[PDB]
Amino acid sequence: PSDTVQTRHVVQHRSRSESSIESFFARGACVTIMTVDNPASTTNKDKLFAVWKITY
Amino acid sequence: SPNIEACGYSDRVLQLTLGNSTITTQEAANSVVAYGRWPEYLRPTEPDVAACRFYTLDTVSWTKESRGWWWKLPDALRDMGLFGQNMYYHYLGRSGYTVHVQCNASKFHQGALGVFAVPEMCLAGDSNTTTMHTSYQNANPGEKGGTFTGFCPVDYLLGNGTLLGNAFVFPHQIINLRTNNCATLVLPYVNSLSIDSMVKHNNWGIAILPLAPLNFASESSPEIPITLTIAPMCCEFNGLRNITLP
């Protein structure tokens, strides 16, 4: 109960699985939004292609 | 009571190095355990040799007009590194003391310094219907220490209405210049409780009075000095509290 010695801590693990490195980052997140099109029009801006450099 | 006769001068120099501290005792022999009981552990957090090292208080000067001096424990040691912290960072704390009072003078100085360790030494206030009286600060001089007089303790009444000639009932040693330079007092933890609140309640009272006056040959050092070295013995505290950084 109410105890304050100076031990190490108190007890041993109590289950921490979902906090592990693999499960910390195991959630997909949006990284970018690339907009394209199929212009019959000569829109040399969006012009079909859209290139994005893979960076977090 | 303390009728001993070691050798007289000096024989061997045995140094007491406890942790970072290093005292070089006159010898080491002629030690008085209070009531014959050693400081033990409560039968917690034990900071050992980190909180068990020699801290040295202010060295006071004994002169022909000196009426005496007195300190409080733990109080005095409240401004000393680790033990001081552990005193203000806990609600509980029991720790003994190895009061080692050393006094050096020449073979041309005469006098008698008696060290009386008084448990629960409340100081002068014939106000039975109310002790404590003198404020926390007027009662806790700290490392500097307070002084007796002929916040006003009367020396012949040991500053508490009891003739000094009886003081010898408490644990004590008489540093009688012509004999030993050193005086050793180990006081075990004495209190009404098992462990206590160190900041509030004062477990001990080291009082060094002058039994014989000082008399230096013709012309010499007008005054000699007395040193108090104290060390916490078997110290325990419970339980840290938000390392309340100042």
Coordinates of N, CA and C in Angstrom, one line a residue, chain A residues 4-6, chain B residues 44-45 239:
Chain A
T4 N 7.0 4.1 0.6 CA 8.0 4.9 0.0 C 9.4 4.6 0.6
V5 N 10.0 3.6 0.0 CA 11.3 3.2 0.5 C 12.4 3.8 -0.3
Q6 N 12.7 3.2 -1.5 CA 13.7 3.7 -2.4 C 14.2 2.5 -3.2
Chain B
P44 N 13.1 0.1 5.4 CA 13.0 1.5 5.0 C 14.0 1.8 3.8
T45 N 14.3 3.1 3.7 CA 15.3 3.5 2.7 C 16.6 3.8 3.5
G239 N 9.1 8.7 3.3 CA 9.6 8.1 2.0 C 9.6 9.4 1.2

